[PDB]
């Protein structure tokens, strides 16, 4: 089972206005499409600098999101293909759920079994039979031979997990990941969009790899099925999602959550810009900004915090920085036994 | 103030080169010091589950200790940079110091395992017809017959050979009182047990 | 020296010497107060410090 998480590198900056206008006229009135595409072509100004935006879209437009959600949809038809997209979406009179199929045969009739595009980050889950995986590997190696076994060099991995819990860069598994990524990249024309290997992660689960890794919506997720490498189905650990099979109603897998490094860095930078822009500012405003940021992070993750042991240190360090800022505001000389009241 | 160490085999992996190796390789000998890593390399410290370093292919009999990676640094760990090779083995200096002055300097000490010249096989060697053909001139004697085998200073002179650095010299250069670490060899050796 | 003078307050790097002078003491005292002689304020091997 191979999962490819990636993102269209510069979709916003590469949406051709004429093609976008045609695609919008496909779905909306030509007057509305012309208005939207003309609104996307205006003079961008900043201080003394100004130019005209004639290639990309302007994301500050109120309807721009719609455009993105439309343009990315087209990319899905380029990735999934019309047949698989129709299988996923179901019949037009009986639309399917988010992750469901009308029949089991439709589910098992294509390598691509799960897909979610989000805004620009596509997560795809393929299930490959040994013959299909071997055929894809040979097809990829036909035009990309690797006598030196160099496919392991640039293969991205989720370093936040230990070596055993990480993805294991075995030769066959790495070859399959590269083959899957190359197959996906070949579908999308290089001009309408593109997928970059460095800014993407492919994780495969096989006999060699027991853990299925990915990252979505700031969550570093790892599924370890109970069948193979679950010594104990512990429930006390509250940062672990306990996946269940809806048919057997039995314990089958186990999901470990973790806060992504990018989310931690974003929170740290938010606290930094709270602190550094706090010279002639009231203590109440600084504490309110800190509280808002902290409650946003903690109520967004709510489980990935406990497993991310680095996030706890980051949070307490940021709290100490805020309290030190307040104390320095009160008096230049730092206190020795300042109270928490 | 002097330990009665005869050779530096005591400092097998406890010498300066071994400590340089341990500092360069970020590990530490049990009795040795601990250092901040020479190069951080935290990303490369935790490498991925390659097919080469695959633990499923690794036979474990005795765990590779820090000492093993120091005794043979170029064999047991990857990236052995700024590493030093330690002296393999000085021959065991079998020196037997006398415990009583009232005993010959050249003495078959009981510490020596007896030679026990066996007569089970009659040792046969080509030796000419005895006392019939070769005769020494009257002026011929062993080279030093007047000189005694050992004086009173023979045992002490021999024991001076296997002495610490300042006491195995006949002469030398005068040092400053600052430049003489009296307890330098106390912590250079292993910590006493208990 | 740290207890007698307190010169580490004006130079923190000087602590490196101070921690050493205590360390040498542990090296000397436990070689000194080893036999019938026990712990006490009698050791006078002051060369190291």
């Amino acid at each position: 089972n191979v999962m490819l998480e990636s993102r269209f590198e510069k979709m916003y900056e590469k949406i051709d206005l004429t093609l976008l206008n045609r695609l919008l006229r496909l779905i909306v009135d030509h007057n509305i499409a012309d208005y939207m595409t003309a609104k996307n072509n205006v003079v961008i100004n900043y201080k003394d600098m100004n130019h005209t935006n004639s290639y990309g879209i302007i994301r500050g437009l109120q309807f721009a999101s719609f455009i993105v959600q439309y343009y990315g949809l087209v990319m899905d038809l380029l990735v999934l293909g019309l047949h698989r997209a129709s299988e996923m979406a179901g019949p037009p009179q009986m639309p399917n759920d988010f992750l469901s199929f009308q029949d089991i045969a439709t589910e098992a009739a294509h390598p691509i079994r799960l897909f979610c595009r989000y805004i620009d980050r596509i997560h795809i889950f393929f299930r490959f039979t040994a013959d299909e995986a071997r055929d894809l590997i040979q097809r990829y190696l036909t035009e990309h031979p690797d006598p030196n076994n160099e496919n392991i060099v640039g293969y991205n991995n989720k370093k936040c997990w230990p070596r055993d819990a990480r993805m294991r860069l075995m030769k066959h598994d790495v070859n399959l990941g590269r083959a899957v990524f190359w197959d996906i990249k070949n579908r999308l024309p290089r001009s309408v969009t593109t997928v970059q290997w460095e800014n993407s992660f492919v994780s495969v689960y096989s006999k060699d790899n027991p853990n299925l890794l990915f990252n979505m919506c700031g969550f570093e997720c790892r599924i370890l099925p109970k069948c193979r490498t679950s010594y104990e189905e512990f429930t006390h650990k509250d940062g672990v999602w306990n996946l269940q099979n809806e048919v057997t109603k039995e314990r089958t897998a186990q999901c470990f959550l973790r806060v992504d490094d990018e989310s931690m860095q974003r929170f740290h930078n938010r606290v930094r810009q709270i602190l550094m822009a706090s010279g002639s500012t009231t203590f109440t405003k600084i504490v309110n900004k800190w509280n808002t940021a902290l409650i946003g992070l903690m109520t967004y993750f709510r489980e990935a915090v406990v497993n991310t042991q680095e996030l706890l240190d980051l949070l307490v360090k940021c709290e100490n920085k805020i309290q030190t800022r307040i104390k320095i505001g009160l008096n230049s000389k730092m206190p020795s036994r300042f109270p928490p009241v | 103030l002097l330990t009665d160490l005869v050779d530096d085999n005591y400092f097998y992996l406890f010498d300066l080169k071994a400590f340089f190796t341990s500092k360069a390789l970020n590990m530490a000998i049990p009795g040795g010091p601990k250092f901040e890593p020479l190069v951080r390399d935290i990303n490369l410290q935790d490498e991925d589950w390659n097919e080469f370093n695959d633990i499923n292919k690794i036979i474990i009999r005795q765990p590779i200790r820090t000492e093993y990676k120091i005794a043979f640094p170029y064999l047991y760990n990857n990236l052995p940079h700024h590493v030093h090779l330690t002296w393999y083995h000085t021959p065991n200096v079998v020196f037997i110091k006398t415990e009583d002055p009232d005993l010959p300097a050249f003495y078959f000490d009981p510490l020596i395992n007896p030679i026990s010249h066996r007569h089970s096989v009659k040792s046969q060697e080509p030796l000419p017809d005895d006392d019939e053909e070769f005769e020494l001139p009257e002026f011929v004697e062993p080279f030093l017959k007047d000189t005694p085998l050992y004086t009173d200073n023979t045992a002490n002179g021999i024991a001076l050979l296997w002495a610490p650095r300042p006491f195995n010299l006949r002469s030398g250069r005068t040092r400053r009182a600052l430049d003489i670490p009296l307890v330098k060899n106390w912590y250079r050796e292993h910590c006493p047990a208990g | 020296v740290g207890q007698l003078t307190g010169m580490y307050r004006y130079k923190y790097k000087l602590m490196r010497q101070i921690r050493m002078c205590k360390d040498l003491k542990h090296l000397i005292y436990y070689r000194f107060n080893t036999g019938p002689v026990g712990k006490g304020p009698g050791c006078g091997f002051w060369a190291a410090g």
């Binding site: 070596r163 055993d164 | 474990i60 765990p63 | 921690r19």
Partner: peptide, 20 residues
């Protein structure tokens, strides 16, 4: 206790104030 120490070592290998 000491038997598990060897296995733990194998796994680990492979997998203001003045202080006088």
């Amino acid at each position: 206790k000491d038997k598990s120490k060897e296995l733990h070592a194998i796994k680990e290998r492979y997998l203001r104030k003045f202080v006088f």
